[PDB]
Paper text:
The R4C virion, comprising 12 distinct structural protein components, has a unique five-fold vertex of the icosahedral capsid that allows genome delivery. In this study, we use cryo-electron microscopy (cryo-EM) and structure prediction to determine the atomic structure of the phage R4C capsid and the in-situ structure of the tail machinery to characterize the distinguished long rigid tail.
The C12 reconstruction of the portal-adaptor complex, with an overall resolution of 4.7 Å, characterizes an adaptor architecture that decorates an accessory Ig-like domain at its periphery. The R4C portal protein, forming a canonical cone-shaped dodecamer with a height of 10 nm, shows considerable structural similarity with portal proteins of other phages, despite poor sequence conservation. A typical tunnel loop connecting α8 forms the narrowest channel with a diameter of ~30 Å; an analogous structural feature (e.g., phages SPP1 and T4) confines the DNA and prevents its reflux from the capsid, with the specific conformational rearrangement in the tunnel loop regulating genome release. The clip domain, straddling the thick capsid wall, is partially exposed outside the R4C head and interacts with the adaptor proteins. The portal complex is capped by a dodecameric adaptor, which is located outside the capsid shell and interacts with both the portal and the capsid MCPs. Following the nomenclature established for the RcGTA adaptor, the R4C adaptor protein can be divided as: attachment domain (1–106), tube domain, adaptor loop (131–148) and C-terminal hook (167–178). The N-terminus of the adaptor protein is an immunoglobulin (Ig)-like domain (attachment domain), and this domain is connected to the tube domain by a long, flexible loop. The tube domain consists of two α-helices, with the α2 sandwiched between loops from adjacent portal proteins.
Numbering used by the authors:
A (entry chain X), D (entry chain W): 1 to 178
B (entry chain L), C (entry chain A): 32 to 162, 213 to 260, 269 to 527
E (entry chain B): 32 to 79
Write the structure that this text describes.
């Protein structure tokens, strides 16, 4: 039947989460429960949200303290209504939400991989600028580095992604304006 | 000899000769339905319809002039005046012309003619008593029952709703119904069907738009597609194509919320790109269309029996002579249709109308000598020429040579000599107050 | 025979024939709504509207000339003068013509005609007592209730707001409402609907713009897109494309504050670049458009029953002859519409107006012999020719051959012979002071 | 004869399944049974569905608890009517349905392979960004990595698929809009 | 008949018929303002 799967796409950890779905569980309203199962995709144990609501409009809520240790990464949203007498469950929803690493705590969090790759390329290029060598072969060991044209290509592709995520990616424009 | 004998690689010519009748009936039911659709939704045919109506009907409609007898001295004007006056009276807006009352005689002619083109003919029925009397009502073509068939042991076939007799003569018609009580045998006298004869052995008439009906549907669909493609081609502007390297992990989440708006309003906006650019070249039919469309179009026009310039207002690449010729050919066709529609409706109606009107005394005259006033002539209206000076000079020369009589010239316009003479007498009275001519 | 029988690969011809009526009603409600939108927002149709109104209405409007009886000596001018004077009086700006008062008779004709084109007909209603009397007010088309349907046990169907009778004759109309009290049966006498008949079996009239309504929407969207693409193409100027090497780490922070302005004002500005340059080639439809647009356009014009040159002022590639022909075809169409609008409104109004006006003594004459003054003729106004010399020579020749009467020539212009004679008497008095002619 | 093979294409595990087929078994109605055989394509034992129906319209149903352990993967649908006296079976149907992994339970389920390949490519590229080497040859061992241009191509193809499955694949559009 | 009935791929013809009046009033206030601007700044209309 009707369904309202709309958790905010950007769900931040340690923060209270609410969608107050409009009509997902309107089918089987009398004897079936509300769930909004949230499952970590790679590991974890599905956590669930119940009701705690006003009767006319269901409002779904999760306490901030409980969110606490939830996994940083990608999470899935599926909504299930279930009745024991019926010995059946019914699934009406689908979605995908990402958990931002807890912003109020922790020793360290770096940027998404695009930054890491980019930073490293700058580092490796720095080394090979000096001490130039395509074969550091001594005694029985030979390293043979990746061609310089190749490294450059990687830098460009990655740099563009970092720009896209930041949102400063639109191609630049200079106005002659006399 | 053996040119069309079969369908080896270039044929389709049936296998055996077949009666146009059955094919004709099925084809016509299907086609009335089809023409109904085309005229309403496509184009060009809406134009045929308009063209037919206007050219064949009348600013003055079709008028009636009746000659009592030999027009030397044996025909007299009194009877003529009375009859004309009476007919025109009820023809003008009144309760009497129709069991409707938003209409009039002019309206009925025009409409019966439109119906005629689109449906290959239509019928009208007369009612007496409820009213005067003899009011004429048109009935839609679809009312006829195509299914009634099967002969009676003592009677002829009733196929396609026509009641044949033992002489196989027409006596009754079998419309469906008003819709509710269906089936009403109606006497032929009440229902008259105009038919535009083509092949003689038919009990019905095909929509005159059948030949071009197929070509037009296809053409309208084409016109609708091309404009749309052109719009798309203008809209997508440039495509920023890329080599096969990146675009990786374009994030899914940002996509749903909005399509980005970027400002290029500033006049000079040299732009620097990360990889490459291309410009869409519209292949939407550009100038190919004018020649291509015309050629398919010429075919349709030939099929509908009308000049291309009139049917579709291309009106291009024409010298004076080309236009004159085209008009001449169409003029013949219109004339033919004009004679036919009134060959049937007017003659039946005038004859039928006269007795009741005489009995009601609506028209003042004695009933017994019906023949003296029986003759009735219907006058069509012609179309004016582009070069009046030449025509006028030729006409003067002809009047001079006793070759053309004065009456014929008036006839081509459709006005008539008696009309001209009455108007001349009025001009003479206007002379008494001022002056005549030098 | 089997040309349009079905929809195998090139069809769409329905499946069975259907009554144009129901289709017609749904189509018309939807279309009145649609035409309302097109005329206001697109183009070309605004032009149709303008064209229709002007050509069919009047600088002098439509005037009235009434002949008491036989125009030899049995018609007299006194009654004529009185009636004409009275009608024209209230036609001029006054409290009497409308329950408005920003309008007049000319205005009502023009408007009823515009309404007619766009909505396929409109209605007017007359009120007496509040006022004189018989004031005419036009009512918007949307007021009619399409939903009222269902027959009464003792009565005929009320579908599309028309009250049929036991004779299935028109007697009442069922507009929604003023809006508030909805539903008012209105006697037919009060409400008259003009209808421009096409196919006869209809209770309503379609917008005459229906055939081109689809083509125009698409065309306006296209015109709006192309101009925009051209602007973008001119604006982006050059693109400085690069090979796949650098552009690395273009810093994010500097981007937000400003788009750099670089001065190229100096005349000679040879420029040296780090990598490569390219020049945008606009693919915005360039010259393809003139031929492409015209061909789609010709189709629309044929559909609307007007010459292309009048509808859209392309006015290109035309010799004198081409123009003359186009005018002739349109002239026929206008004439037909002209007869129809006044076939209905004028006749009903004049007839209805006369009794009240006679009773109020607004017009001085006796009521009992109504028939003597009953006849009323409405005069349309014609359009002038390009070459007057030829026309004049032809006219002289015709007057010479007793073929054309003097009255007809005046009629084509629309002025009329009595008018001409009165004016001639005025010219004669002006002669007494100075001189006449040689 | 007539047949109504329409199991919903997306059949979720542990959930009750029903098509209520309209006319597949109308032939041989009096003495032949209803089956709707469901067979795991790679392994498994065909499970079957019977009637439990209203007489006028057959309705086919499967209990949720029974579905429980059914295999995650691809499954086939074939409908058979069989009569012993006739010693014949008749097959009137064909189809293919996928079983989504049970959403209400389990230690872990990752995304479909497209995600795995993509994630890994990001990981491998990260390593070779630094420690650049096309031949780590020491003593008697030589690794020789895949060329960097090649790795990049794989990333792009896969990324597109992930986009297609998610449905965010339509090519992007920026509207100048002045 | 069914030519302009809706907005499937080539339309925009509203959804229901509406009184030109209200549309007319809003349109006209906005347009007096607009024409004021065009006549003064563009071209062709100054010519009209």
């Amino acid at each position: 039947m009707t369904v309202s799967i709309h958790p905010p796409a950007t769900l931040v950890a340690g923060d209270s989460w609410a969608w107050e779905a409009g009509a997902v569980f309107e089918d089987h309203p009398d004897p079936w429960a509300a769930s909004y199962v949230l499952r970590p995709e790679a590991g974890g144990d599905p956590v669930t949200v119940s009701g705690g609501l006003e009767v006319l409009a269901p409002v779904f809520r999760l306490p901030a303290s409980v969110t606490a240790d939830l996994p940083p990464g990608e999470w899935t949203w599926f909504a299930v209504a279930v009745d024991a007498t019926t010995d059946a469950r019914a699934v009406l929803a689908q979605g995908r939400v990402t958990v931002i690493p807890d912003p109020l705590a922790g020793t360290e969090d770096r940027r998404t991989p695009a930054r890491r790759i980019l930073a490293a390329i700058e580092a490796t290029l720095e080394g090979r600028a000096t001490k130039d060598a395509d074969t550091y072969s001594i005694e029985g060991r030979s390293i043979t580095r990746t061609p310089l044209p190749d490294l450059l290509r990687l830098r460009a592709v990655y740099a563009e992604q970092v720009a896209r995520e930041t949102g400063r990616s639109p191609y630049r424009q200079r106005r002659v304006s006399f | 000899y053996r040119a069309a004998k079969s369908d080896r690689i270039a044929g389709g010519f049936g296998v055996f000769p077949t009666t146009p009748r059955d094919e004709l009936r099925r084809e016509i039911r299907g086609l009335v339905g089809h023409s109904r659709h085309a005229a309403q939704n496509f184009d060009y045919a809406r134009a045929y319809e308009m063209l037919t109506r206007r050219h064949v009907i009348g600013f003055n409609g079709i008028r009636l002039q009746m000659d009592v007898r030999d027009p030397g001295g044996k025909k007299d004007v009194a009877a003529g005046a009375q009859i004309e006056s009476a007919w025109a009276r009820w023809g003008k807006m009144k309760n009497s012309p129709t069991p409707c009352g938003r209409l009039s005689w002019w309206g009925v002619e025009c409409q019966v003619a439109t119906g005629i083109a689109r449906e290959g003919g239509s019928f009208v029925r007369i009612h007496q008593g409820t009213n005067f009397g003899f009011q004429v009502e048109p009935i839609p073509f679809d009312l006829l029952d195509l299914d009634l068939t099967g002969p009676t042991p003592g009677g002829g076939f009733v196929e396609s709703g026509v009641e044949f007799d033992a002489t196989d003569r027409v006596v009754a018609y079998h419309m469906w119904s008003a819709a509710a009580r269906r089936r009403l045998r109606i006497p032929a006298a009440q229902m008259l069907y105009v038919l535009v004869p083509e092949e003689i052995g038919q009990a019905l008439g095909v929509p005159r738009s059948a030949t071009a009906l197929r070509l037009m549907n296809l053409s309208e669909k084409f016109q609708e597609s091309a404009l749309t493609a052109a719009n798309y081609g203008a809209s997508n502007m440039v495509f920023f194509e890329r080599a096969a390297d990146n675009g990786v992990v374009t994030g899914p989440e940002d996509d749903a919320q909005i399509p980005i708006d970027q400002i290029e309003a500033g006049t000079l906006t040299e732009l620097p790109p990360g990889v490459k650019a291309v410009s869409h070249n519209p292949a939407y039919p550009d100038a190919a269309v004018g020649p291509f469309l015309r050629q398919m179009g010429t075919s349709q026009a030939a099929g509908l029996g009308v000049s291309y310039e009139t049917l579709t207002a291309d009106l291009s690449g024409a010298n004076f002579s080309s236009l004159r010729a085209g008009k001449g050919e169409e003029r013949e066709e219109w004339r033919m249709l004009q004679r036919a529609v009134f060959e049937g409706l007017h003659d039946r109606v005038f004859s039928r109308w006269l007795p009741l009107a005489m009995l009601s005394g609506e028209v003042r005259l004695p009933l017994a000598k019906l023949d003296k006033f029986d003759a009735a002539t219907w006058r069509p209206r012609g179309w004016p020429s582009v070069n009046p000076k030449d025509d006028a000079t030729a006409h003067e020369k002809d009047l001079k040579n006793g070759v053309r009589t004065r009456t014929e010239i008036c006839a081509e316009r459709g006005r008539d000599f008696a009309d001209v003479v009455a108007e001349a007498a009025a001009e003479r009275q206007m002379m008494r107050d001022a002056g005549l001519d030098p």
